[PDB]
Design a protein around this ligand. Structure first.
Ligand SMILES: *C(=C)C1=C(C)[C@@H](Cc2[nH]c(/C=C3N=C(/C=C4\NC(=O)[C@H](C)[C@H]4CC)C(C)=C\3CCC(=O)O)c(CCC(=O)O)c2C)NC1=O
Ligand SMILES: *CC[C@H]1/C(=C/c2[nH]c(/C=C3N=C(/C=C4\NC(=O)C(CC)=C4C)C(C)=C\3CCC(=O)O)c(CCC(=O)O)c2C)NC(=O)[C@@H]1C
Ligand SMILES: C=CC1=C(C)[C@@H](Cc2[nH]c(/C=C3N=C(/C=C4\NC(=O)[C@H](C)[C@H]4CC)C(C)=C\3CCC(=O)O)c(CCC(=O)O)c2C)NC1=O
Ligand SMILES: C=CC1=C(C)[C@@H](Cc2[nH]c(/C=C3N=C(/C=C4\NC(=O)[C@H](C)[C@H]4CC)C(C)=C\3CCC(=O)O)c(CCC(=O)O)c2C)NC1=O
Ligand SMILES: C=CC1=C(C)[C@@H](Cc2[nH]c(/C=C3N=C(/C=C4\NC(=O)[C@H](C)[C@H]4CC)C(C)=C\3CCC(=O)O)c(CCC(=O)O)c2C)NC1=O
Ligand SMILES: C=CC1=C(C)[C@@H](Cc2[nH]c(/C=C3N=C(/C=C4\NC(=O)[C@H](C)[C@H]4CC)C(C)=C\3CCC(=O)O)c(CCC(=O)O)c2C)NC1=O
Ligand SMILES: C=CC1=C(C)[C@@H](Cc2[nH]c(/C=C3N=C(/C=C4\NC(=O)[C@H](C)[C@H]4CC)C(C)=C\3CCC(=O)O)c(CCC(=O)O)c2C)NC1=O
Ligand SMILES: C=CC1=C(C)[C@@H](Cc2[nH]c(/C=C3N=C(/C=C4\NC(=O)[C@H](C)[C@H]4CC)C(C)=C\3CCC(=O)O)c(CCC(=O)O)c2C)NC1=O
Ligand SMILES: C=CC1=C(C)[C@@H](Cc2[nH]c(/C=C3N=C(/C=C4\NC(=O)[C@H](C)[C@H]4CC)C(C)=C\3CCC(=O)O)c(CCC(=O)O)c2C)NC1=O
Ligand SMILES: C=CC1=C(C)[C@@H](Cc2[nH]c(/C=C3N=C(/C=C4\NC(=O)[C@H](C)[C@H]4CC)C(C)=C\3CCC(=O)O)c(CCC(=O)O)c2C)NC1=O
Ligand SMILES: C=CC1=C(C)[C@@H](Cc2[nH]c(/C=C3N=C(/C=C4\NC(=O)[C@H](C)[C@H]4CC)C(C)=C\3CCC(=O)O)c(CCC(=O)O)c2C)NC1=O
Ligand SMILES: C=CC1=C(C)[C@@H](Cc2[nH]c(/C=C3N=C(/C=C4\NC(=O)[C@H](C)[C@H]4CC)C(C)=C\3CCC(=O)O)c(CCC(=O)O)c2C)NC1=O
Ligand SMILES: C=CC1=C(C)[C@@H](Cc2[nH]c(/C=C3N=C(/C=C4\NC(=O)[C@H](C)[C@H]4CC)C(C)=C\3CCC(=O)O)c(CCC(=O)O)c2C)NC1=O
Ligand SMILES: C=CC1=C(C)[C@@H](Cc2[nH]c(/C=C3N=C(/C=C4\NC(=O)[C@H](C)[C@H]4CC)C(C)=C\3CCC(=O)O)c(CCC(=O)O)c2C)NC1=O
Lengths: 164, 285, 73, 177, 172, 164, 177, 164
């Protein structure tokens, strides 16, 4: 998993040397920013079904053509799996808010996603539009704190730039 | 050993009680052992030197070494005799420069290395800030150490495998609600009745949809199979008694653009909660 | 008496001896003149405001029936 | 490779449950105790060479058949390889103490070390003794009960870290045992 | 196969040295619980069929795919094999709980179970979910009085849950 | 130079990816611990000739045999270069206190030192004994602050473990 | 009045001893389980309104002679005073359980109560029963074994606080006897 | 004794109320602060022989006139009783660190002191000289921790302010 600890022990293992002062200095900042990212992750965990419901209809509101026959959102089985995949992506974002890095995103949602979405005829723009809608409905004092919103929108922009 | 002020702090033991370095000497009873070591080796006349490990040095004795010191009195006696040195009189901190040897009262000669203000008596560093104290009566000089002088000859039987390896017992963190509910699933179904399904948990709202089709707990109870023949006329009543309310008055709340609706269809099943019920409080029958 | 005592022995004394607790409450209101026999109202507002509290206090000088008790005589 | 934070991620991904509320107590206590953890890994790292040399010298001075002619630590090549073998295990245990999880110790050090020492003819018992001596040095260096050197720490209690590093050290012994 | 008493002796022969007194009062304390531990295993072996059937029923009301036609829980032969695989792990968890050490659990239950389930195509994660549902019911059933003297048993139910988690991570 | 920034940009360059949140999270701890290590480095810079003069004496006092003929400390040219090399090592420690990592030590004093000291008959134990004496004469409130002493003694132990 | 902390201070002041490390094992164990004492007091003060009408009506159901003409609970005024008592005693017992010491119980509630109830003609046998039913409700509410109200708690053992409040209630009963 | 406990349940007893959430909330701070205020308790209890010794001679060093005939410390037994008073006051400060309030001080050293010290000609300035000498000799990382030193000094200066 790409995180703060793993990068520096992997670098020290590649160099074959003991943990120096720079490695521990990198963990002090993890201690600092965990006060914001953990209470971002907790607020995402406590209210996730509202956000997954709210961002799911923005996809079909922007792209109403998916419910036509021949498309990828015809019957209820496709829309249910659409909501399930959006919930999967929100869970991976909650995981990356906890681990401190983009590890769980890069390995459980991003790597290999392009071949699946091209093969199974899933348009990536509508997998993107839900994440884009989720980012813009984030006010600074209401939904979370100030740094928690920065920490949340950074992972949202990472997922958006990965799928686009 | 009675009171340190009475007659000031002139007596030998009271003077040291007034100093703050080695309180452990009287906290325990090493003062009696060291007195017996000053009579067993006739150290009284010849001017000797003593190295005292201060407080904190005593507080950092390893548990397996402290256990050995408290289960063998000859070990304590040897360790204490190894802190009293007759080799070169009552020397100050300006006579220990260089790398040489000192002769203990009993043990074998112990190497010391003094480089300016940083003096080591082997395994232990002298605290220069509070030392070089010469007592005229009973002539000897006193120095303070950061650690007990522990020769390798005495701590050869002390091992961490002998039962001092640090272990912290782990504990569970369940709740009363969870345990009360789960205990009903430990009785046979012919006895437990409805409670036999009490080990199931809420699942993500999409697990109840077409592909997966997870069953809720309300589907295992007779409430989901009630379809009686009789019915209520809903006309016999005088006007003004029947009441009707919707869940909302809005097009795209009762049914969004997509098919994900909580009020119309078969998708009102796809909700995060509602996966279990608290109707197992009634009875076991 | 248990809320005006400062040390724990002084509250223990009022606890053990009831006449001592009756007298301390009196001597406490005498040296700081919060009795009604030294209270002077300032406005006629406050005079009526004190009269209301005193009318409540006189009512406990009668019985639950309404008969005058032998205390207020 | 998983640390303490990633371990709850993999535990709750088997759940398909969000992490929040119940699972956050251990992570917030891990964060609140992080200065002691860095303060302990620094104390182990600063005394590494004396620890490795003292452990191998203790293992030899308890069992002198290793430097016997035909023993496993006989020549200079075998002695240098044994010092390296000990130093690598200390490095990986330090990694596992820094990460707060022993998953990095399993994947890169202990996966197949059991029969590697068998194919080499390395004696299993001696290595366990060296590991236990290194463990006994590590707990004394963490809890500042080292008799040869005293370090500077803020006052407090960190025997949980001593139990955790003792829990890492016996794990290694078991794998090669 | 070791018990917790044989553990310290097997580590004492290795150094060739007598048990010091700190290991001895570590062991007399472990004797001094004693009755609590057997109260725990008595509660689990009194209700074993209920634990197994309720956990399997919750597993299939949760995952209906195993009993779907084509599922790994399809037919009788496979369903019968699944019913008492769980009862095997419950039996060996109770053996390890009465022994005080997970040595019988690793020797003859968890040794080679993973490639056994791989060679058959059995999904090991669902076995782990079944183990977790047996664990929850066992720790729920363990801490009730049911006519026992009141006291704390927390260090024992933590060890009982640890045996279940050791079984659950080794299967998958 | 081995530092906090260089490790994470080298890791991101080896992976071929943009700086993620873990990289910036590692720099917040540099911002945190620079308040201690810089005022350790400044106090070392302001009083270095007292420490070097003191350090050199300790080595000779421990090893008085170096001033004998045939040894490496015979005349004044050897003792002057001894003080110069001790001052070099203290300057590299001041540099590592500034850069945040062990870069200037590992490349200007440590790499290649063993071949030089074996070839030129320089005993490494006496190049070590001065650094060992410098570490033990560090009191917690007098010489610097509390975390500055930790930051100083960590690099001293790194140099000692490298030469031993 | 005193509490659990000051109780050992008057014990050490009787011999001019400093409070040393022997004395603080009893008090650091008082702090360790400080969350359980607050969770136990909160369960009692939540159902304290039901507890008095529970206990006094139980005391009536056993002895109809109290509501008999001329009986001690015969008037509405006397029944209100008995319910007023059922609450003062429950208040001071919950003070003593919160403080961890029975000192505030027997100089503010029980000191002078026996000769008061003798001078009033309050039946002592009937009193004992009103306190014992409240004691039985206290052990049920602390150990979470009430019939028709269960409260949410973290799992663990609580028989020590239940035994402490049971020790306070028979102090009350022996005082009024 | 005035403590965190005995304050909130006498405020509840005077109003006739059950222990509310404020009463429970006040004792939660008695859980946090008791890690710091009890750490100074055994520190003063174990080294209580050197502090009385170091305060008593500082009292007579500030005021050498007390050893004159006719004064308070003219003979030996009066100085013996003078050191006993500083031992008494340090014992009461040790008690107040354990209760968590100024209970034992206000009951056993403060109440009635201003009568006996004027009747028996004991100068209060010589009493506060020893307590002030104890106060400025608190090495905040060496004697104890930081917050334990704050809790110790706050009880020393309370006695200083009450005696003057
Ligand atoms: C008369 C002959 C008679 C009664 C009147 C009745 C009273 C009684 N109740 C108990 C035992 C309990 N009483 C409790 C008080 C309450 N129960 C509640 O649930 C609410 C919160 C509150 C009153 C509104 C409680 C908690 C118990 C313990 C068990 C439980 O779960 O309820 C006794 C003593 C023991 C007994 O006799 O049952 C009495 C006298 N019972 C009568 O017999
Ligand atoms: C809840 C049931 C889970 C499940 C069980 C399952 N197992 C099998 C097949 C076998 N299981 C074993 C296991 C053991 N043999 C042992 O001796 C021991 C003691 C340590 C164990 C744990 C073996 C040997 C088999 C093959 C023999 C057979 O059962 O006929 C099967 C299917 C049977 C088959 O594969 O033909 C099931 C269904 N699988 C699940 O889906 C559940 C998660
Ligand atoms: C753990 C990480 C993880 C993920 C991120 C998801 C990723 C993911 N999504 C889908 C699958 C899907 N994603 C969609 C979604 C859409 N298609 C549309 O018509 C709209 C554009 C949009 C609605 C939001 C649909 C319809 C499928 C099912 C495709 C199909 O079966 O034809 C699939 C195929 C398997 C399946 O779900 O049946 C996978 C692997 N799954 C994971 O396991
Ligand atoms: C944890 C993840 C999380 C988010 C991504 C956001 C997203 C979000 N917004 C709203 C809900 C809302 N959001 C707003 C928006 C705003 N209100 C203001 O004071 C601002 C000026 C402005 C933001 C710029 C308003 C007005 C509502 C209520 C009406 C609505 O449903 O949109 C809701 C429904 C629950 C609620 O009432 O808050 C959610 C989940 N909030 C979250 O908790
Ligand atoms: C229970 C709490 C507790 C304390 C408050 C101190 C109190 C204390 N320290 C010293 C004794 C000492 N105290 C110090 C400490 C300092 N000297 C200074 O100049 C600095 C201001 C300060 C460190 C920052 C030193 C250096 C000594 C030894 C030499 C001396 O007396 O100054 C003495 C004299 C008797 C003795 O040597 O022990 C006393 C009472 N120790 C304790 O156990
Ligand atoms: C940023 C890089 C970094 C480091 C270089 C180390 C350095 C370090 N150690 C501690 C601080 C500490 N370190 C310890 C640990 C111990 N103390 C002992 O007495 C035992 C011997 C040992 C544990 C067994 C303790 C108990 C504290 C006090 C604060 C705390 O408990 O977290 C602190 C926080 C308080 C302070 O600033 O002093 C720091 C920065 N930690 C870091 O975070
Ligand atoms: C990533 C983890 C990792 C390790 C743990 C080591 C493991 C390891 N050690 C050795 C190799 C060895 N390891 C030892 C060590 C010992 N023999 C003894 O008698 C003592 C008990 C013990 C020293 C304390 C010796 C002596 C050899 C060399 C054997 C030989 O030369 O024949 C080898 C063979 C390759 C070689 O070094 O030549 C390997 C892979 N290497 C790794 O890459
Ligand atoms: C016959 C061969 C023989 C040896 C080579 C030594 C080796 C040795 N050292 C220690 C024990 C130890 N070894 C160290 C390590 C060190 N201590 C220091 O002062 C240095 C900084 C550092 C390198 C020397 C520490 C810190 C301890 C325990 C505590 C202490 O001594 O302060 C132990 C006990 C381990 C245990 O408990 O099982 C042994 C066997 N002893 C022997 O019997
Ligand atoms: C056939 C096997 C067999 C047994 C197990 C025991 C069963 C048993 N256990 C206890 C005794 C006990 N049993 C328990 C256990 C518990 N109390 C609780 O509240 C929890 C629900 C549960 C913990 C899991 C405790 C805690 C004690 C002792 C009471 C105490 O230690 O304070 C006693 C009383 C004698 C004694 O205390 O030693 C007996 C006979 N006897 C047997 O012959
Ligand atoms: C930038 C990094 C940097 C360094 C760390 C030093 C490292 C260093 N030191 C010495 C060189 C030396 N170091 C010593 C020191 C000693 N020998 C003794 O007798 C005592 C053991 C000890 C005194 C402290 C001596 C005597 C020389 C000169 C060797 C010689 O010329 O014979 C040399 C050889 C060139 C020279 O200085 O003339 C070098 C490269 N120089 C650097 O440029
Ligand atoms: C920047 C790098 C740096 C260091 C490595 C140290 C090293 C150091 N120590 C001293 C000087 C001193 N150091 C001490 C030592 C102590 N005094 C105490 O209060 C403590 C109890 C004890 C430390 C444990 C004493 C007593 C002196 C003065 C006597 C002497 O020259 O040693 C001096 C001379 C200048 C001075 O007076 O401080 C230096 C450079 N100080 C530094 O500035
Ligand atoms: C500070 C502590 C404190 C208490 C403990 C109570 C107790 C108490 N109760 C009464 C007074 C009384 N107390 C009772 C109570 C009872 N009679 C019974 O038969 C039952 C056994 C029991 C109720 C359960 C009754 C019935 C009276 C009224 C007597 C009367 O009016 O003649 C009185 C006299 C004052 C009065 O007349 O009201 C006092 C002091 N009040 C306090 O201030
Ligand atoms: C201001 C108000 C205030 C409170 C009400 C308490 C609330 C409270 N209770 C407990 C925590 C607890 N409470 C109990 C008590 C019990 N559990 C049972 O199963 C028994 C029925 C009952 C015994 C009487 C136990 C066993 C714990 C966990 C152990 C502990 O924390 O000490 C905890 C710690 C766990 C947590 O919630 O984080 C807290 C904060 N504390 C406060 O600060
Ligand atoms: C529990 C708290 C407690 C105290 C604080 C002391 C207070 C105190 N001191 C003295 C009595 C005395 N106290 C002193 C003390 C001093 N004179 C000085 O000049 C200095 C200010 C100081 C020494 C440093 C002396 C000299 C006497 C003897 C006076 C006399 O006998 O008349 C007495 C009279 C009875 C007696 O002799 O003990 C009392 C009550 N005693 C206590 O029980």
């Amino acid at each position: 998993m790409k995180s703060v600890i793993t990068t520096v022990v992997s670098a020290a293992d590649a160099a074959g040397r003991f943990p120096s002062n720079s490695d521990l200095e990198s963990i002090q900042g993890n201690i600092q920013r965990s006060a914001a990212r953990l209470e971002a992750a907790e607020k995402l965990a406590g209210n996730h079904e509202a956000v997954v419901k709210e961002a799911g209809d923005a996809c079909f509101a922007k792209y109403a053509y998916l419910k036509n026959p021949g498309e990828a959102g015809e019957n209820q089985e496709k829309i249910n799996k659409c909501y399930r995949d959006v919930d999967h992506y929100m869970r991976l974002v909650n995981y990356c808010l906890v681990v401190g890095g983009t590890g769980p995103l890069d390995e459980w949602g991003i790597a290999g996603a392009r071949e699946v979405y091209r093969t199974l005829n899933l348009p990536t723009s509508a997998y993107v539009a839900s994440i884009a809608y989720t980012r813009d409905r984030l006010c600074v004092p209401r939904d979370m704190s100030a740094q928690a919103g920065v920490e949340f929108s950074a992972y949202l922009d990472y997922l958006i730039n990965a799928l686009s | 050993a009675a009171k340190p002020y009475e007659s000031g702090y002139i007596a030998e033991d009271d003077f040291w009680r007034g100093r703050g370095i080695a309180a452990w000497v009287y906290a325990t009873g090493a003062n009696k052992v060291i007195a017996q070591i000053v009579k067993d080796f006739n150290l009284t006349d010849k001017k000797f030197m003593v190295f005292i490990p201060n407080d904190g040095a005593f507080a950092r004795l390893s548990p397996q070494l402290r256990k050995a010191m408290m289960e063998d009195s000859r070990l304590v006696y040897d360790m204490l005799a190894g802190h009293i040195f007759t080799s070169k009189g009552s020397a100050m901190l300006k006579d220990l420069q260089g790398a040489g040897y000192l002769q203990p009262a009993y043990g074998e000669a112990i190497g010391y290395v003094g480089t300016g203000r940083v003096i080591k008596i082997g395994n232990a560093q002298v605290i220069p800030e509070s030392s070089d104290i010469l007592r005229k009566n009973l002539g000897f000089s006193a120095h303070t150490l950061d650690t007990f002088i522990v020769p390798k000859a005495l701590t050869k039987k002390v091992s961490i495998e002998a039962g001092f390896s640090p272990v912290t017992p782990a504990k569970y963190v369940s709740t009363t609600k969870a345990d009360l509910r789960y205990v009903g699933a430990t009785k046979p179904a012919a006895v437990g009745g409805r409670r036999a399904m009490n080990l199931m948990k809420q699942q993500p709202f999409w697990m109840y949809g077409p592909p997966y089709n997870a069953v809720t707990q309300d589907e295992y109870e007779p409430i989901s199979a009630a379809a009686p023949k009789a019915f209520v006329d809903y006309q016999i009543f005088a006007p003004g008694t029947v009441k009707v309310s919707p869940d909302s008055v809005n097009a795209n709340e009762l049914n969004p653009v997509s098919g994900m609706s909580k009020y119309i269809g078969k998708t009102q099943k796809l909700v995060g909660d509602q996966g279990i019920s608290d109707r197992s409080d009634k009875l076991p029958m | 008496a248990l809320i005006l005592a400062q040390n724990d022995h002084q509250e223990k004394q009022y606890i053990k001896y009831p006449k001592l607790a009756a007298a301390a409450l009196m001597a406490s209101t005498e040296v700081t003149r919060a009795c009604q026999r030294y209270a002077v109202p300032e406005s006629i507002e406050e005079e009526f405001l004190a009269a209301s509290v005193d009318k409540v206090n006189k009512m406990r000088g009668t019985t639950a029936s309404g008969v005058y008790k032998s205390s207020c005589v | 490779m998983l640390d303490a934070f990633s371990r709850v991620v993999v535990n709750s991904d088997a759940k398909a449950a969000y992490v929040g509320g119940s699972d956050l107590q251990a992570l917030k206590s891990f964060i609140a105790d992080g200065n002691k953890r860095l303060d302990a890994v620094n104390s182990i790292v600063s005394n590494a060479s004396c620890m490795v040399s003292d452990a191998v010298s203790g293992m030899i001075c308890e069992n002198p058949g290793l430097i016997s002619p035909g023993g496993n630590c006989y020549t200079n090549r075998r002695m240098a390889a044994c010092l390296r073998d000990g130093e690598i295990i200390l490095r990986y245990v330090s990694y596992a103490l820094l990460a707060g999880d022993a998953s990095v110790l399993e994947d890169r050090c202990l996966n197949g070390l059991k029969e590697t020492y068998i194919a080499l003819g390395v004696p299993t018992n001696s290595s366990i003794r060296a590991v236990s001596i290194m463990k006994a040095q590590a707990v004394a260096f963490i809890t500042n009960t080292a008799t040869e050197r005293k370090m500077s720490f803020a006052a407090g209690d960190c025997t949980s870290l001593a139990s955790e590093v003792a829990s890492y050290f016996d794990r290694v012994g078991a794998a090669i045992s | 196969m070791l018990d917790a008493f044989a553990k310290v002796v097997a580590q004492a022969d290795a150094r060739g040295e007598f048990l010091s007194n700190t290991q001895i009062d570590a062991l007399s304390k472990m004797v001094k619980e004693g009755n609590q531990r057997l109260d725990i295993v008595n509660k689990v072996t009194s209700n074993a069929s209920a634990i197994v059937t309720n956990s399997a029923r919750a597993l299939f009301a949760e995952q209906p795919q195993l009993i779907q036609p084509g599922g790994n829980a399809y037919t009788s032969r496979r369903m019968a094999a699944c019913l008492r695989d769980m009862e095997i792990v419950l039996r060996y968890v109770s053996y390890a709980m009465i022994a005080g050490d997970s040595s019988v659990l690793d020797d003859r239950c968890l040794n080679g179970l993973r490639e056994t389930y791989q060679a058959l195509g059995t999904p090991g994660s669902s076995v782990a979910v079944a183990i977790q549902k047996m664990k929850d019911a066992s720790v729920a059933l363990a801490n009730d009085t049911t006519g026992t003297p009141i006291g704390d048993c927390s260090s024992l139910v933590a060890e009982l849950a640890g045996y279940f988690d050791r079984a659950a991570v080794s299967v998958v």
